[PDB]
Amino acid sequence: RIIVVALYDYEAIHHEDLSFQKGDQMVVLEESGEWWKARSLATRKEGYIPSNYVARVDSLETEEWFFKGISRKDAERQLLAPGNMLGSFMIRDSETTKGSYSLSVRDYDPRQGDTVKHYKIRGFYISPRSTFSTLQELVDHYKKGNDGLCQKLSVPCMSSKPQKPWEKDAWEIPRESLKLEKKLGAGQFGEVWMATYNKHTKVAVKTMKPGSMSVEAFLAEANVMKTLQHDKLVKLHAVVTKEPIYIITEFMAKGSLLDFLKSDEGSKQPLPKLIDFSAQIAEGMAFIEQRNYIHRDLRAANILVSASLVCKIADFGLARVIPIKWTAPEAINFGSFTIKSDVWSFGILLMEIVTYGRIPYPGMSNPEVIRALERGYRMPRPENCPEELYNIMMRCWKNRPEERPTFEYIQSVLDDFYTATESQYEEIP
Numbered sequence: 001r002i003i004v005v006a007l008y009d010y011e012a013i014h015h016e017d018l019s020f021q022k023g024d025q026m027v028v029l030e031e032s033g034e035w036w037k038a039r040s041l042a043t044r045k046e047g048y049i050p051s052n053y054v055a056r057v058d059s060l061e062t063e064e065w066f067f068k069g070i071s072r073k074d075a076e077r078q079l080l081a082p083g084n085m086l087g088s089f090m091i092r093d094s095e096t097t098k099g100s101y102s103l104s105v106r107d108y109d110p111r112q113g114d115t116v117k118h119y120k121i122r123g124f125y126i127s128p129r130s131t132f133s134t135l136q137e138l139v140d141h142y143k144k145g146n147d148g149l150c151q152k153l154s155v156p157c158m159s160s161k162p163q164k165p166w167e168k169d170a171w172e173i174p175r176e177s178l179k180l181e182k183k184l185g186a187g188q189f190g191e192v193w194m195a196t197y198n199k200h201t202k203v204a205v206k207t208m209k210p211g212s213m214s215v216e217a218f219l220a221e222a223n224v225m226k227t228l229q230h231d232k233l234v235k236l237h238a239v240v241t242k243e244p245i246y247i248i249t250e251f252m253a254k255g256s257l258l259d260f261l262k263s264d265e266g267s268k269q270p271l272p273k274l275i276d277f278s279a280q281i282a283e284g285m286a287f288i289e290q291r292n293y294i295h296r297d298l299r300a301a302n303i304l305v306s307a308s309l310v311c312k313i314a315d316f317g318l319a320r321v322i323p324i325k326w327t328a329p330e331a332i333n334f335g336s337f338t339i340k341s342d343v344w345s346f347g348i349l350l351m352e353i354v355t356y357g358r359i360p361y362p363g364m365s366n367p368e369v370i371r372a373l374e375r376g377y378r379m380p381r382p383e384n385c386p387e388e389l390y391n392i393m394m395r396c397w398k399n400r401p402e403e404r405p406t407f408e409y410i411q412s413v414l415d416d417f418y419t420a421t422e423s424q425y426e427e428i429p
């Protein structure tokens, strides 16, 4: 017997899936990955449920202040989101001290403004002065005035329902299931439409126009990208095998990063949040790097922004199934695309972000640039760019692609850009 409990509200949208309120319990009957067959205890109905909407009874995940599988940087982003205030906190798996837990607390500071400070927890305790049998008790105490903390505990971090998992056994779907409602953009290779999958589900469809490339071999290449899932890559949901091929991805509410930075709201975005974007793209490129693959076309036009202002990477694994200002020299000439050729493109993308979407090398045509890259000309630093940030672009713009950084390093440098190493966690006597 395995009892689980709902963490959020879910209304059914399919045939054999269940509806449940927050707090409903149910018996796990089958573990089919993203979807589980369960029998509700409230309605006694047997059906399918999203496994990422429930957890085992009286687990820590059930608790409103606990956050599973979240990094220190995500915990920082989640707390500095709108809807939280002074004292807003969370308890999470310690990213560094594995098998243990850390506490992230929102705090204000005149020097910078809102910040997130992190304390490690070691029965548990932070300072030997105060011992605690369990976390909830430990929480309660620190809600009663800051016992050494930078602030007194107020409310757990605001969380929203995760994205509903895709329909089961629906990697290949008929076109009839779709209603392409609005053309978002078109190009030399096809159109990107925003659509709807059998009502209830809002998707975006990339219509791949008929060609030589992968007529019967697209599904093959495309089936690999499906296994390269990441929180910072655009999620591939479904595919239409009948030519013209349709690619169903998740809908990114605020379009491309390029169009977004050129937007009004985008122009309002300050500098530390632009670097936050960069650190997200770098996080995604660090994954493609770990899988020893390649994106082949990094630019703001290929970065999408969610409604929550989360940057994700598209298309990826598309240039291998079919423009040079973002391209490194050793690919313009020798046609050699490495993971380091993307590093160059990231440096360009970085500048593209700091300049709010300004075209690289402005008032400077393509041929008038290639002959400068041989001289050693690089784009200059603008007034609004940190010296230590232009420093990174230049490292991405090294002539030797071997002495260019890794995305693993680039991400780490961008994640704690305003944080000194020693200041990551707080000391307490």
Ligand SMILES: Nc1ncnc2c1c(-c1ccc(NC(=O)c3ccccc3)cc1)cn2C1CCCC1
Pocket: 184, 185, 186, 192, 204, 205, 206, 225, 234, 247, 249, 250, 251, 252, 253, 255, 256, 304, 313, 314, 315, 316, 317, 318
């Ligand atoms: N998903 C979206 N949601 C909201 N807006 C989107 C998009 C997309 C968009 C971008 C890229 C893709 N395609 C892919 O990511 C992809 C395609 C084939 C193989 C592997 C990956 C599909 C849609 C593009 N836009 C905008 C940007 C420019 C035109 C409309």
Ligand SMILES: [Ca+2]
Pocket: 422, 423, 424, 425, 426, 427
């Ligand atoms: Ca310290």
Ligand SMILES: [Cl-]
Pocket: 027, 039
């Ligand atoms: Cl039962």
